[PDB]
Design a protein around this ligand. Structure first.
Ligand SMILES: [Cl-]
Ligand code: NA
Lengths: 252, 250, 251, 251
């Protein structure tokens, strides 16, 4: 099942889509500059691109580290990104009250892994009618994603994306089970599956190996965060090379 | 470090405190019925007791499944429970705005395991000044608990209980690492550590007993559960072990 | 199911048995010294005691680490330990051909975790008729122990002990599942279950004590060490064990 | 570091080598039927190929299982394979005495995962000077493979292949950490790293094995290790397609 996000086709058998940007919206000029560079590189390589950032990072390293610009200023920044570059945007939501105002501006709204089973937030997100990215919790097995998917379907929304970010592996460590992608495809109606390589890690050699491994299984998209910015092009050339190959061959 | 909750002394070298009650509050009458049972068994065995309940099921089976009586109704029931039995109570909170009004009624407020890293909830809970129970996430190392403790401490609240609930073990399984209790005690300033045996699980009663005794053998401040006279039989054995452990020099 | 080892009763509802000693046998004099210390401490507390050592260690830290005195001298040393102290002994075997001669002297023969599924060894061990200690591999679930037990039964030996050593938990780390003991008792006919607390670590003595107490709280036939510190430790284990064993299994 | 095996160059930046065949040798006629199929498919695909088989199943299902053809007959069959086809072969060895006589014939000798820490077997395999395939235990982290490599180097053999087979993940389940390939490259002097996709999966279909094989080979590996109306050929066309692409990109 494919999902149209403006003029982009997202699907497990379509050219991969890059979800990328910055961790926290900190500033207007810096967000536009970072986005500009993603846009330049992705346009150069013909890779569909969705800009990603959080306006309210609810899980932070210290209690007083900057949470981000907040809802109202964040949505203004997202508006400017869309106007300037003509691209879709993605951001997370943490409270039901945020869902409507965020969905009015943003093309994809994201369900944070730690809130993945909060029924109130799931219903509130489903009822926006927006395309939704479901972050798979590290403590949740790939077969348990259909339970989240069914809660969205009950509440009236089937425009869902499932996002791998790794699995708990002993203490303080993550492993990405490459078979999980297929389990999610076969148990959740072949909805688009994307891979958050950044949060699946802990290094640029690791990210590349892990991204290539993932994309070899035939995925709708790759999800990353950047600070290295200038090595983006070399990275994407490799991802595109593998994706073009995999996608050019019929499924067996 | 000990924590006083009314006339109960909670701490890792004190007689263990039982935390128990129901999953989610449905009605006044069934709530008072469950609590009376717990008070009856715990009084005759001489075990300090704190009643536990959630006013909301945050993760429902269905979009249209029953959720619980909610905040305003839940709090009224907790006020009744306290009035009738004169015992402390504990409930979990899921949104920052809920923290202060829950804290007015409930002696201990609980940080759910999924929300343990929600910085706004941590602050709001800390602001209340109430005793806080921190549910250790199944995906978090015991040595990482010190980071959650630090945040409560920078938010001005040191009345913290650390609660074990097992660790992710492959897919859809949990294991309890008995060494984690010790790591938490050493790294988090000997705050009271309690063991949620109920959530650490998923002959099934025999399992809870083996697991509870193994946990309590490491010297814990309390035992946390949801649950012939099966509670009685269980607690008689736990108290015997706890009495022995706590009578040995550290 | 109980197992008689000379005058010792080993079982999940009998007073715990201590298994311990030295890593590898070097000399008669050196062995008698360590053994004598274990014997004196355990005798002082009335804890039954089985002395453990390897005569030929297959899984050494380095290629050229001393392997031990070897079969012939090793067995002479075990014979002396038995005569001097009147206690049973335990040793690992890793080749089928050594099982019979070792079983002439050693009361309990031990199957290394890494050879737990080597059918040849299992059969050679079974055929001795001796009590056998099966070390559970860290990658084997407690519900798989039944299969090892079945292979010993097929080979004519039911006198088996199951030895817990921990489970792989991510990379490097081991975790001991306290529920595994129960699963093994329930699925393997209540064969005696012992707890190798030392391997299970990785150690700190504080950690050893917590982990040992936790496991013994589940009601176990014995405690296995790969080791007045021993006295203080054994006093605590005995306290817990006497309490647990004194109470009826849940009604 | 590359390794020459007859006319095959094995290395993490060379075209992948297939290590392929069966579980155990049963008949000489049944073995040639399998090998001939592997050879014709790989030759037309231009994939270098090494024939794999065991001469003994050391972990029987029951005590009364089909162990296999045995050593004496096995070596004769491997002879016949190398004469007929002109390819290298690989097999596992489980006892130190077997190593030199097996290495006289079999180009690559394999350290079973369960015996990874058997020091006598490591030294015996090392001493043959043959290329050695090290099966990574499901319980060993990739950071710790360097310890086995260390022992082989110390015993004087550097022609080592590292074979990934998955990692213990909870009970009775395996996960393959795609990052471990890189860890092993970086910590073990860039020795050839191969991927046993078959064993990595036997706790979970061709669809599965393909996804997993493609993911692993995407990390740039020296080879693929497997077991088994034209499924191998179709499967290998897809692997070669990805390998060719990956190997043509600069590191
Ligand atoms: Cl031992
Ligand atoms: Na929208």
């Amino acid at each position: 099942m494919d999902i149209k996000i403006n003029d982009i086709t997202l699907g497990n058998n379509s050219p991969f889509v890059l979800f990328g940007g910055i961790n926290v919206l900190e500033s207007l000029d810096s967000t536009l500059q970072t986005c500009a560079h993603y846009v330049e590189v992705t346009r150069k390589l013909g890779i569909p691109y969705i800009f990603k950032a959080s306006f309210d990072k609810a899980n932070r390293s210290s209690i007083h580290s900057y949470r981000g610009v907040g809802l109202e200023e964040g949505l203004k920044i997202f508006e400017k990104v869309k106007a300037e570059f003509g691209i879709p945007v993605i951001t997370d939501v943490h409270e039901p009250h945020q869902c409507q105002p965020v969905a009015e501006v943003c093309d994809v709204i994201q369900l944070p892994a730690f809130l993945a089973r909060q029924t109130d937030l799931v219903v509130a997100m489903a009822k926006t009618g927006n395309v939704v990215n479901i972050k798979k919790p590290q403590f949740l097995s790939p077969s348990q994603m259909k339970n989240i998917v069914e809660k969205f379907h009950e509440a009236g929304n089937g425009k869902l994306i499932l996002c791998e970010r790794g699995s708990s592996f002993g203490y303080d460590n993550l492993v990405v089970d490459m078979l999980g992608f297929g389990v999610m495809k076969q148990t959740c109606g072949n909805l688009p599956v994307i891979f958050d390589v950044t949060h699946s890690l802990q290094r640029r050699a690791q990210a590349l190996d892990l991204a290539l491994a993932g994309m070899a299984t035939r995925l709708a998209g790759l999800f990353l965060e950047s600070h290295p910015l200038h090595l983006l092009e070399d990275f994407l050339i490799r991802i595109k090379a593998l994706d073009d190959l995999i996608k050019s061959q019929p499924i067996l």
